[PDB]
Every structure is written in C-alpha cells, then in structure tokens.
Design a protein around this ligand. Structure first.
Ligand code: Y01
Ligand code: Y01
Ligand code: Y01
Lengths: 90, 90
C-alpha cells in the first residue's frame, strides 16, 4: 500500500511551492563513494515533472482564478439575498 | 551536454517556489576550512536572479492571469455551445 501513498505524496505538495529539489534529479551512476546505478528512463521524470508543474501551477490555478472571478458577481448578489432571506429563520 | 541541462534546470524550478537558497550566494574566498576563491562577477548572479524572479513570478504569471480572466467569458460561451453541438457526435 506504500505505492498508492507514493502516488499522491510528493506531487500533491508540489503544487504549494515544495518541489523537493533534492529528489528532482539526484546524481547517480558516478563516483563522488560509489553512487547507485542510474535507473533506466530516470531522465524522463524531471521532464514530466516540468510539464506537470507547468500545467498544474500555471494553467489550472489561474483558470480557477478566472472561474472564481467571472462568477463572483452573480454569486455575491445571490448570497446577499439568501442571507437576507435566512435572517428570518435565524 | 550538461551545460544545456544546467541552463534549464534551476531557473525552471525557480518559478514554483524553490529559489535554491543555499546556492543564491554561498560564502567564498574566506576561511570558515579554506573556501574556494570567489569567481569574478559572481555578485551579478543574485542581482539578475532578483530581476528574473521579479519579471517571471510577478509580471508574466499575473499577466497570464489577466489574459485568462479577460478572455474567459467568450471562451466559456463558445465552449458551452461547442459541447452542445458535439453531443450529437457523441
Ligand atoms: C475524488 C476527489 C473529489 C476526492 C479524492 C479521493 C481520493 C483521491 C482519496 C480518498 C481516499 C484516499 C485513500 C485513503 C487511504 C489510503 C491508504 C494509504 O496507505 C498507506 O499509506 C499505507 C502505509 C504505508 O505503507 O505507507 C495509501 C493512500 C490511500 C490509498 C488513499 C489514496 C487517495 C484516496 C483514494
Ligand atoms: C519555459 C518553460 C515553460 C519550459 C522550459 C523547461 C524545460 C524545457 C526543461 C526544464 C527542466 C528540464 C529537464 C531537467 C533535467 C533533465 C534530466 C536530463 O537527464 C540527465 O541529466 C541524465 C541523468 C543524470 O545525469 O542525472 C535530461 C534533460 C532533462 C529531462 C531536462 C529537459 C528539459 C527540461 C524539461
Ligand atoms: C518551444 C517551447 C514551446 C517548448 C520547449 C522546447 C525546448 C525548450 C526543449 C525541448 C527539447 C529539450 C532538450 C531535450 C534534451 C536535452 C539533452 C539534455 O542532456 C543532458 O541532460 C545530458 C546529461 C548530463 O550531462 O546531465 C540537456 C537538455 C536538452 C538539450 C533539452 C533542452 C531543452 C529543450 C531544447
């Protein structure tokens, strides 16, 4: 079950300004002490990290900003009128 | 080819809240153990870092917020009508 935890753990905190910079692309397959060998296709992980961070943090958050902004006025008027209606129930 | 990787590595993650604070301006050219000597013009790197972070994070992201916001209504109406058209194809 730790695999399912590792699916959601670091990509979720990646949205809130913690990119885990020590684990983006650690040096491996060299001697600095002998490092463990390079996993195959481990260079893909920073690239899809870049695409994910771009899509999430720039596209979806700003789109939710636009959604919150362009539906603010109708929701504000409806909420004011509904609160004035629910004053009687209170 | 590691030079081309180093071009894109840290400035890209600099947008998402990871400024790499240990490598902004490390102490050098002193004894704390003898540090390696100061590179010439290494003080320029935090200044252009400051200008880059300002321009990127404050100018361009907020401008994309404005672009997403002011074209939201036309895109929303067009997308609703296009989805209602593509219901038949589905
Ligand atoms: C659909 C949207 C609106 C809500 C989000 C729901 C899911 C994305 C959440 C809710 C329940 C969550 C699960 C609740 C419990 C666990 C057990 C957890 O197990 C461990 O951590 C085992 C311990 C370990 O070995 O570390 C792994 C994550 C997981 C599957 C969670 C994965 C994410 C889930 C499916
Ligand atoms: C302006 C923005 C919207 C896009 C520009 C950013 C990307 C084009 C950059 C940022 C991070 C970069 C990646 C950072 C690290 C790597 C790992 C690198 O692989 C290795 O170095 C091998 C393994 C190792 O030596 O540790 C291959 C390039 C790649 C995928 C880079 C490809 C280009 C990326 C995706
Ligand atoms: C134009 C916009 C819309 C898209 C962005 C495209 C480029 C900015 C990307 C796409 C392909 C990328 C290249 C794909 C592969 C590599 C090899 C990579 O090589 C290594 O990492 C060598 C291993 C090492 O020594 O660390 C260095 C980055 C580089 C040149 C990447 C640099 C960034 C590039 C040019």
């Amino acid at each position: 079950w730790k695999l399912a935890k590792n699916i959601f753990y670091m990509p979720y905190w990646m949205i809130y300004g913690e990119v885990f910079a020590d684990q983006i692309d650690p040096p491996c397959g060299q001697n600095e002490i002998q490092l463990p060998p390079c996993k195959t296709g481990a260079w893909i992980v920073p690239a899809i990290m870049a695409c994910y961070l771009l899509v999430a943090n720039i596209l979806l958050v700003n789109l939710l900003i636009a959604v919150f902004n362009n539906t603010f006025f109708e929701v504000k008027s409806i909420s004011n009128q509904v609160w004035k209606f629910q004053r009687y129930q209170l």
